[PDB]
């Protein structure tokens, strides 16, 4: 019958590894690099679009950076379509929490929920896992500014600075070298762009090949503002930091 054609997506290898998870991670290693850096006064999200065209409408385009709510955003590395399925689920989860408790969802609770959904696809159902890794940038009044990552296994971890996608080994070494604990957002913006500029597979880093976002308490007084950078604003910050 049908058993003949079943790939068995949720089995261990003899070494105790999940085949499909490992292969999904291999897929993600070819995706455009995304970087997150956490500072004392905010968080930076920087990401590289994959080999674009001059006829691509950039100002209406979004493939890397997505808003989950007013306090939490994600950077994507992997299959964009897979990511949008999970993103919509996360947006709903945040609203469910807000309706139930009348408070914005704490960052970790949202991250744990999405990570559990990824985990399920590795243990039951016989379906392929989501070929997506996320960087979560968010703020809540318990832990303040937070960075997390999750991958197709459904495992998640917290970070001061982190990269996903292509050339993460090189990127992480560069971040580990220049990152300091008392760093500020404007310094973190520079570090993120410098790291992408060195790790990129492209000839040069330009505005049309980037997506950029900040989460700042640089919102007038006791509140947090998300800023998804426009193409012209990415062009300006590239000049300011002296990359173009």
């Amino acid at each position: 019958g049908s058993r003949r054609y079943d790939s068995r997506t949720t089995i261990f290898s003899p070494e105790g590894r999940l085949y499909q998870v490992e292969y999904a991670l291999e897929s993600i290693s070819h995706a455009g690099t995304a970087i997150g850096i956490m500072a004392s006064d905010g968080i930076v999200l920087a990401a590289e679009r994959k080999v674009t065209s001059t006829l691509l409408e950039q100002d209406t385009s979004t493939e890397k950076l997505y808003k989950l709510n007013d306090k939490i955003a994600v950077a994507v590395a992997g299959l964009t379509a897979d990511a949008e399925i999970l993103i919509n689920t996360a947006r709903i989860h945040a609203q469910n929490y807000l309706k139930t408790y009348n408070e914005d969802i704490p960052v970790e609770i949202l991250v744990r929920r999405l990570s559990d959904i990824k985990q399920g696809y590795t243990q039951h159902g016989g379906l392929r896992p989501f070929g997506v890794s996320f960087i979560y940038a968010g703020y809540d009044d318990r832990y303040g500014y937070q960075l997390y990552t999750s991958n197709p296994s459904g495992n998640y971890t917290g970070w001061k600075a982190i990269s996903v996608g292509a050339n993460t080994s090189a990127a992480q070494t560069l971040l580990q070298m220049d990152y300091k604990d008392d760093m500020k957002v404007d310094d973190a913006i520079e570090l993120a762009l410098k790291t992408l500029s060195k790790t990129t597979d492209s000839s040069a880093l330009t505005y049309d090949r980037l997506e950029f976002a900040t989460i700042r308490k640089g919102a007038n007084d006791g509140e947090v503002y998300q800023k998804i950078f426009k193409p012209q604003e990415i062009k300006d910050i590239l000049v300011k930091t002296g990359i173009t």
Binding site: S2, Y5, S7, A24, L55, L56, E57, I85, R128
Partner: protein, 250 residues
């Protein structure tokens, strides 16, 4: 009986490739060329009516389809897959939007819904991916004119102009040289006809070419008068005669 294929037929290979999606893209590559160009005051989508037999009435086969009064779609790849996607796209525009908000969806969100359907055929049990790439052109009040490509994976990207299928690589290069941000709709149609001629072997006329635009509101195609705010559809399919008129000024 019962569908006993509850497992994924698309899976990651050791190299990280999703084979069935790659193979679906190969089917799209074999398909007839279709293109889209965005102007300041409109969008044009076009393709060749590759008739399978001269006894066949190719007017009864619609490659360019109205999704909403302000949104149209064209494809390259497997025709039957396209036809059912058009049926699903038309319905989801109503069920997940118009029956909720009392208005037709914006282009980007309808594209998002079609993309979701195509993504699910890439992960759900006992199904293969859709063997088509779509080009969706549309207009809405707050986003203006837009053009999107949707691939078998479910990924979608916005374009100023693009081409898919057989001679897409050559066609995209042709479009890069001609496109600017000051094009009027008639200029975009002219460029569309020029671009499409390169990938067509045989007859090149209004009967072998299918072309539609997203442009001005057409009150003559509304079917009723009396409501000022209702001004008619922006989607319009060009006639055989209208295409031939522009082939003399070619």
């Amino acid at each position: 009986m019962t569908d006993r294929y509850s497992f994924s037929l698309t899976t990651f290979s050791p190299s990280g490739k999703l084979g069935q999606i790659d193979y679906a893209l190969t089917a799209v590559k074999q398909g007839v060329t279709s293109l889209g160009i965005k102007a300041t005051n409109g969008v044009v989508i076009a393709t060749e009516k590759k008739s399978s037999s001269p006894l066949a009435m190719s007017e009864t086969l619609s490659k360019v389809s109205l999704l909403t009064p302000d949104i149209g779609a064209v494809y390259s790849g497997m025709g039957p897959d396209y036809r059912v996607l058009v049926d699903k796209s038309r319905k989801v525009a109503h069920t997940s939007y118009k029956r909720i908000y009392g208005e037709y969806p914006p282009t980007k969100l309808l594209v998002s819904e079609v993309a979701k359907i195509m993504q699910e055929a890439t992960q759900s049990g006992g199904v293969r991916p859709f063997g088509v790439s779509l080009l969706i052109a549309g207009h809405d009040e707050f986003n203006g004119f837009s053009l999107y490509q949707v691939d078998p994976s479910g990924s979608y990207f916005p374009w100023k102009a693009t081409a898919i299928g057989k001679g897409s690589v050559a066609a995209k290069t042709f479009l890069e040289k001609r496109w600017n941000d000051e094009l009027e709709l008639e200029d975009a149609i002219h460029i569309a006809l020029l671009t499409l001629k390169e990938s067509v072997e045989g007859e090149f006329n209004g009967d072998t070419i299918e072309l539609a635009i997203i442009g001005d509101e057409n009150p003559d195609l509304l079917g009723y008068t009396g409501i000022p705010t209702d001004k008619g559809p922006r989607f319009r399919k060009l006639t055989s005669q209208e295409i031939n008129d522009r082939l003399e000024a070619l």
